[PDB]
Each structure stands twice: as structure tokens, then as C-alpha cells.
Amino acid sequence: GAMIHAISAVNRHLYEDVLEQHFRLRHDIFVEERHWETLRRPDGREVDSYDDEDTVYLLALEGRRVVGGHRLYPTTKPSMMSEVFPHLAAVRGCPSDPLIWEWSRYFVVRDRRDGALNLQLMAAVQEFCLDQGIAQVSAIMETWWLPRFHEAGFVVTPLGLPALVENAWTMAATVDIRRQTLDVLHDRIGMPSIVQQDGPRLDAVARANLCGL
Ligand SMILES: CC(C)CC(=O)N[C@@H](CCSC[C@H]1O[C@@H](n2cnc3c(N)ncnc32)[C@H](O)[C@@H]1O)C(=O)O
Ligand SMILES: Nc1ncnc2[nH]cnc12
Ligand SMILES: [Cl-]
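That is the input. Now the predicted structure with adenine docked in place:
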């Protein structure tokens, strides 16, 4: 029934309502609830430097209601990891590759927490990337993500030493995108497909090669 929709430059004309709704939800959740004060904005929309033409949004929709989601951004452009937290990836280095995208802003609305949605969101990043031929995703993440990644069968490679970021233990890591990981998650969520891709076909790797130039 309810699906996670892939929204990008090529199809956002079908999702302008939904995108605006999600920017406001990001403000409610990341700013008001989690207190990431650096992201507070007076328009009540949580929008940063990595919300632009090249961003891909994976949003869980029930009708036109956003109930969860996350976003992906190219590592071939300046990214949050490369610009804000490069020291967190000092051991292995900060990724820069059309085949590696930075994963961020993972959220679930209160009404849908501790239910089926969470594992669907985990399957969604694997499904989208595999479809696009994206090999890995990178993230700056709170260290409590490690057991969550492991529970979902994600293959994780730490990029540097954990460090305190605004009173919270944080780290940089890559996740290997795997057909094997996805197949198990499809079995667990009881659905052969969780990502809906309406409108024109997105070629993410081509777009990342372009903005790399
Ligand atoms: C996808 C999931 C596994 C990991 C995840 O959701 N990762 C999150 C970041 C987890 S770390 C939380 C800290 O990052 C700061 N932060 C977030 N965006 C920023 C920005 N644009 N500039 C400066 N600081 C920023 C914010 O103020 C917190 O202190 C994300 O990338 O959206
Ligand atoms: N902010 C948080 N800290 C620790 N565990 C969590 N599980 C979900 N959110 C969390
Ligand atoms: Cl804007």
C-alpha cells in the first residue's frame, strides 16, 4: 500500500506540496524535538546548504502525508562530511565518487515510531541505491546508529575516530549497498518493492558525474 517515493530534480514538479511539508517536519523533528539549534530558521523550514538541485529525497508517504524519510546528496560536490566534519573521516579519508552518496536527515514522525515504517526506510536506501548502481552511502551519524545498522544487516566501514559533536558521540562511516542485504530486508518487510519512482527516470550517477565537473 504505502510506499517510499524517490523525489529529485527530474520529478519534483509532482511533489512540491510534499517537499514543503517535509521541510517543516524536519524543523519540528530536528530543531524543536532534537534541539539541533544550528539548523533553526525563522521561516520554520529546515533547509541547509545540501538541499539543492542535486539532492534526492526518499519520503515515506501515506496518501500525501509525509510520515518519514531521509535524503541523499552527491559526494562529488562539497558535502556536510567534507565541509563541516572532515576530521571525523581523517583515518580513511572523505569519500568523493559518483558511486558514493551522502545519506542524512533520517526521521520518522511520532505517530509511526516503533512500528513497521523504520525497517521500510532501511530497505529504501538499499533499494534506491541498488537500482541506481550506487555502491556505497556515507554518513555522519550518532554512534547509537551502529547497532541499528547491524540489526538491519548493513555492512559498515568506519572512516575515523568517534568524537563529541555538540555533546553527542558522533562518527563518520560508509555503508556498503548490497543486493544480499536488500533481499533479506524485502523478506522482513514482506514486500518485493518499497521505493516508488513516479515521473521521468532519474539517472543519479550521471548527475553526480556532471556536478563533479
Ligand atoms: C542517515 C542517518 C544514518 C544519519 C543522520 O541522520 N545524520 C544527520 C547528522 C547526524 S550528526 C548531528 C549533528 O549534525 C549537525 N548538523 C546537521 N546538519 C548540519 C549542517 N548542514 N551544518 C552544520 N551542522 C549540521 C547538527 O547540528 C547536529 O549537531 C544528518 O546528516 O542529517
Ligand atoms: N536520540 C536517541 N538516543 C538514543 N537512542 C535512540 N533511539 C532513537 N533515538 C535515540
Ligand atoms: Cl528554500
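The chain has six helices and nine strands.
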